[PDB]
Symmetry: C3
Subunit: 139 residues, 3 copies
Amino acid sequence: MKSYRKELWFHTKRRREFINITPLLEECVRESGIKEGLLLCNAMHITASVFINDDEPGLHHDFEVWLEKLAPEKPYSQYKHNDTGEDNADAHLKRTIMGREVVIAITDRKMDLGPWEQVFYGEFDGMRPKRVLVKIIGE
Amino acid sequence: MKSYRKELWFHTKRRREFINITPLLEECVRESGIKEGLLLCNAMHITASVFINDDEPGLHHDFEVWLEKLAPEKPYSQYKHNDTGEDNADAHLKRTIMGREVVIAITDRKMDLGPWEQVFYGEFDGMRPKRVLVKIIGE
Amino acid sequence: MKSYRKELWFHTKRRREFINITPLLEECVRESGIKEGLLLCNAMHITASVFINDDEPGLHHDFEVWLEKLAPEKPYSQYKHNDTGEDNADAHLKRTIMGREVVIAITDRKMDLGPWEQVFYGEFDGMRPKRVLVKIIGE
Ligand code: NA
Ligand code: NA
Ligand code: NA
């Protein structure tokens, strides 16, 4: 059985950002040499996400607005997690909505994706070095 | 290592629908011949879901009402994704709540499920041909 | 190919509870003897979750408050699922937010986790025996 592992690192300019990581995953799959298998890609931090959706700026804006509605950043005081000086309680909630991980089929050496599937890193508490894990198993 | 792949296609009569796909997955598992492994089942479209929950009509109604509360279809104008004539922004949000995928253990040639687990395709922007992927790896 | 399976059982004192199960998963991984692979851990019941986040009491409180906002338990009458005497409709919704499952990479005989990742059983309709499945495949 083959396995492959890679950490992808991010340090976003702002607190929140969506980053299309599809091409990075494509290169992981390619270098793994795995023909058939499963790929896991997950945020290694509990204030960020890996998810699949559209790469369209309007929709990215809509996710920002929606996540702020469902899990508002402010006031910081509304969250007990922030009681001793942290301010990232909302990021733990936002990541929960978008999800921690994707699992993607590898078929004939490629990610087995639909026409509009793109993989994103969803940063909700950035401006510091954070990590995504790619793990592939198969043959 | 064995692997198995199947696309399951749907064309729903209405915009939104839940479809119990458990029996289809059972037939995938059976024909794969895999005894022990992991099964991924995911929506290949970014406006639909695969999830596990109850097959009970009251609950299906409750999910419809709840998803409309969390991610209302209308007005279309509230979403920037819809600015150039699409109207499916809400479906990208609804699918995010329900999830893209399930991963299910295969044990002794069967899906390793609890007593009430049923697998659903959650269509949020239907009336067109859309796809679910089943991928199984193991031995 | 190696595979490993274990059911972990819970019977919570109260309706809702978060339980850190990370050490149990560590022991599964250890006893499996698997060096490289993927671990699935999922709630086998459709009113509970397995998820990864912080083990911090303030945040646990915040999740409780947030989930009650997004998917209120009461009044029971607001949910059609509860129409014939059940009262757990909200638990099916809450679990949907937190998620059914985690998938975790196994690397060099260990769960491949970031610095603050902890795995939780999220019980939303407890006080009865319920189950989590751990399944590991790899070599
Ligand atoms: Na935090
Ligand atoms: Na769209
Ligand atoms: Na129920």
